[PDB]
Subunit: 159 residues, 3 copies
C-alpha cells in the first residue's frame, strides 16, 4: 500500500492577556498564546503534518495571514479544510501522534478533550489520535514558560 | 496493514553528581542527567513514541512519577513494560529511529551498545533499531551543555 | 509490507561571509550557514532521516572531502538502496526567522526529488519562523526537521 508520513512543528509566545487554546480546548491560565487567531499550537502542528504527508506544501501556503477566505477562521476550521484537501489528493488518514511542550499549566486533565476535538475534525476513531505533554525541565524559553511548542506526526495512505 | 506512527521528545538537565545513563549505557562522565528516575533521556523519548503510536497516552500516564518505584527507576524496565502494554493493545513494533543531541561527551563509542539495549528491550533485531547523535552546533542551552535532548520515531502495526 | 520510518534533525549557525544554501537553493542573504560542508541544514536533516529509516546509523558515521550536501544526499540514497530499501516519501520543515523561504520551496522540492530519484509528489518541504523565540528567533541559526518512510523490498 501507498503509505506516506508527515511531520509538523509549531511554537508561539506565552504572555498575559490572551486565552490559552490548545487542541481546540480553552484552558484556564493567567496567560495565553500570541498569534493570528487562536494561536492553537497543537492544531497548527497537526495541520502541517497532514499537508506534509500529502506533499501539499504547508499551512501558510493554504491559509495565508492575508487571505479573506480565512480571515476569521479558527484552527479547527483550518484543520477540517486541511483534511478535505488531503482527502481530495487521494489520501486517507491512518493516525496522528503529538507532543505539547509546556512547563505549565498541567495539560493532562485536558488530553481526552483535545483528542476528541481532533478525531472529530479528522473524522477518525478516537484510538487513532494521541496527544502527549512534556515539560522542558526548566531549560530554555520553553522551560522559563515564555512559549509553548507542539510536535506532530501523521501517517496517511493513498486510496 | 494497520500501521501507526508515534513520535517522542525528552530533555533533562546535565548536573554534577549523577550517573550519565543514555540508552541504558552508563557513560564515564563527570556529570549526569537530572530526573526522578535514572533520567535516561533516550529511552524516555522512545517510550513516549511507542505509547504514542499505540494511542496509549504518554509516559506520565503509565509510570506515575510519585510512585516510590519511580525514584531511581531503570528506564529499560520502563521501556520493557511499555512494550508489554503496546503488545497487549495488539501492536507489533516494526522499527525505531532516534537522535540524541549533546555537546559532550562523545557518544559514538556507546551508540552500538544503546542500539543493542533498545533492541533487547523491544525484542527486535538490531537492524530495526537506530540511534543517531548530533551536537547542536554550539547553539542554545544544548550548545552550552546544560542538558541533553532525545527525539524518537516508532512505527508499529496492529495485528 | 516491510515499512520503516526515520527522523532527522539539524541546526547550523548563521555567519557572515558564507552563501545561504538550503535544499540546494542559494538564497540571497547577508549571512550563510556555518559547517565543514556547505552546511545545507535541510539536506542534512533528510539525509539523517533516510539513514535512520534504513537503520544505517547517521550522517557522521558515513561522511567526499570537498563534497556539497547534494552529493552527500545522493550517496545516502545509494547506501539506502544498497541495504535493500526503496524510498516512499520525505517530509520536512525549515525553521528560520529570516529570510523569506516561500519563493524557494518548490525549487528545493525539485532538487530533493532529483537527488532521491523520486517523483515530486513524494517530496515535501515546509517552513516556519520561531516567533522570535530563542537562538532561532534571534536569527543566530536555522533548524531543519525531516521524516522519511522507506520499504524493504
Ligand atoms: N523564513 C520563513 C518562514 C516561513 N515561511 C512561510 O511563511 C508561512 C507561514 O509560516 C509558510 O507558508 C511558510 O512556508 C517563509 O516563507 N519563510
Ligand atoms: N504541561 C504539562 C507537562 C507534563 N505533563 C505530564 O507530566 C508528565 C511528566 O512531565 C508528562 O509525561 C505528562 O504526563 C502535563 O500534564 N502537563
Ligand atoms: N555528543 C556527540 C555528538 C555527535 N557525535 C557524533 O559525531 C558525528 C557528527 O554529529 C555523528 O556521527 C555523531 O554520532 C558524538 O559522537 N557525540
Ligand atoms: O512497572 C514498571 C516499573 C518497572 C521498574 C521500576 C519501576 C516501575 C514503575 C511503576 C510505577 C512507576 S515506576
Ligand atoms: Cl553543541
Ligand atoms: K527543538
Ligand atoms: Zn501556530
Ligand atoms: Zn525523561
Ligand atoms: Zn548539518
Amino acid at each position: 500500500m501507498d503509505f506516506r508520513i508527515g511531520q509538523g512543528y509549531d511554537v508561539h509566545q506565552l504572555v498575559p492577556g490572551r486565552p490559552l487554546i490548545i487542541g481546540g480546548v480553552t484552558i484556564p491560565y493567567e496567560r495565553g498564546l500570541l498569534g493570528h487567531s487562536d494561536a492553537d499550537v497543537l492544531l497548527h502542528a497537526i495541520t502541517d503534518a497532514l499537508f506534509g504527508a500529502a506533499a501539499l506544501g504547508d499551512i501558510g501556503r493554504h491559509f495565508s495571514d492575508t487571505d479573506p477566505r480565512f480571515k476569521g477562521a479558527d484552527s479547527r476550521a483550518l484543520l477540517r479544510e486541511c483534511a478535505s484537501r488531503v482527502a481530495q489528493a487521494g489520501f486517507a488518514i491512518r493516525n496522528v501522534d503529538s507532543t505539547i511542550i509546556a512547563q505549565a499549566p498541567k495539560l493532562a486533565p485536558h488530553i481526552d478533550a483535545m483528542r476528541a476535538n481532533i478525531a472529530a475534525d479528522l473524522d477518525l476513531p478516537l484510538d487513532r489520535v494521541n496527544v502527549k505533554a512534556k515539560t522542558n525541565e526548566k531549560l530554555g524559553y520553553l522551560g522559563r514558560g515564555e512559549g509553548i511548542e507542539a510536535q506532530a506526526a501523521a501517517l496517511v495512505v493513498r486510496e
